[PDB]
Amino acid sequence: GPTYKYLQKPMYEVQWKVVEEINGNNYVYIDPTQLPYDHKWEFPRNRLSFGKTLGAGAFGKVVEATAYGLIKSDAAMTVAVKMLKPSAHLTEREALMSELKVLSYLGNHMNIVNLLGACTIGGPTLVITEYCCYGDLLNFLRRKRDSFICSKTSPAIMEDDELALDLEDLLSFSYQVAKGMAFLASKNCIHRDLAARNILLTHGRITKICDFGLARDIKNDSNYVVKGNARLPVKWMAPESIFNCVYTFESDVWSYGIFLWELFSLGSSPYPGMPVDSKFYKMIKEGFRMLSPEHAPAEMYDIMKTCWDADPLKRPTFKQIVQLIEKQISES
């Protein structure tokens, strides 16, 4: 209804950013509304059947659905559908349109959650993406955790996957996520919230980097902390990024280092037991770092440490990380 303050209610926002140029120092981003939309993506909404909710946030949700003829003309497939509230204002719907445009611009890669289609006419805006049957990687690591150190106990069952977790899995996830992020970086794209909770797993134990924002309300997740005017994933953020309030290619790399730590720690939360407050920010800026997880190979811990270099310029690029891990594989 009518309000007497200009500041608009919180609404869904586009999550990933595309960089136009770095003149600094500072980043200038592309305005996503200016990107094209190809109507080849348009899918008759009557060909969707909605199932269970996968995750819901304050503004909308993502649901499991079946789609008929979406990719192969005479076949049904399971997909994930992103939606706002049915009466969402056009300005909020436009954020979903901009998201659709960014996904289209990025293009397809095995290690992201890919765009499959959209319903932008004839009703509430829907974005159709890949369904990842095993859910998020953080939960997967936690369910499978006990099997890493026991070969007698039956591994936790997740859908059809009754297999144990081993070092080969962790090395594979490390490599896959690095490739996915190298892909995003190659398109000048910044994720801003890379973490195990936002990486999904599908058939073949393939990891897919996700934009999960619509599917949770961060007020209910203690890994997001009030810091100034925002609630932020501070334990995954680079110190200079927290201080200057800017997300960069180098701060995504910092996050990948934190991801490697939680990966080889089998789903433990970072800086365990450490209060997140004035003292935490100070200690990280002054050089405090986590030590190696028990299960992390030395070369992976070494990558972690470089991802956490106080100087953003000295951190590896994702391209360089991919090369390093591929060197590991060849020598293995």
**Structural domains present in the chain:** 1-131 (3.30.200.20), 132-332 (1.10.510.10)
CB-CB neighbours of 71 under 10 Å: 10
- Please, what's the b/e burial string for 284-318 (b: 16 or more CB within 10 A of its CB; e: otherwise)? beeeeebebbeebbeebbebbeebbbeebeebbbb
| Residues with a known catalytic role | 193
The amino acid sitting at 295 is H
What's the chain look like in SS3? Answer: CCCCCCCCCCCCCCCCEEEEEEECCEEEECCHHHCCCCHHHECCHHHEEEEEEEEECCCEEEEEEEEECCCCCCCEEEEEEEEECCCCCHHHHHHHHHHHHHHHHHCCCCCECCEEEEECCCCCCEEEEECCCCCEHHHHHHHHHHHHHCCCCCCCCECCECCCCCHHHHHHHHHHHHHHHHHHHHCCEECCCCCHHHEEEECCCEEEECCCHHHCCHHHCCCCEEECCEEECHHHCCHHHHHHCCCCHHHHHHHHHHHHHHHHCCCCCCCCCCCCCHHHHHHHHCCCCCCCCCCCCHHHHHHHHHHCCCCHHHCCCHHHHHHHHHHHHHHC
Annotated binding site: 27, 55-62, 82, 130-136, 197-198, 211
CA-based nearest residue to 283, from 245, 247, 234: 234
State in Å, rounded, how far the first CA of the chain is from the last one.
63
Experimental method: X-ray
- Please, what's the b/e burial string for 178-189 (b: 16 or more CB within 10 A of its CB; e: otherwise)? bbbbbbbbeebb
- Sequence-distant (≥ 6) Cβ neighbours of residue 116 within 8 angstroms: 67, 70, 71, 79, 128, 129, 130
Question: Phi and psi for 199 in degrees, rounded to 5?
Answer: -115, 130
- Resolution to 1 decimal, in Å? 1.6
Q: How many CA atoms lie within 13 A of 72 on its CB side?
A: 6
Annotated binding site for Mg(2+): 27, 198, 211
Annotated binding site for ATP: 55-62, 82, 130-136, 197
- Sequence-distant (≥ 6) Cβ neighbours of residue 312 within 8 angstroms: 238, 240, 248, 250, 251
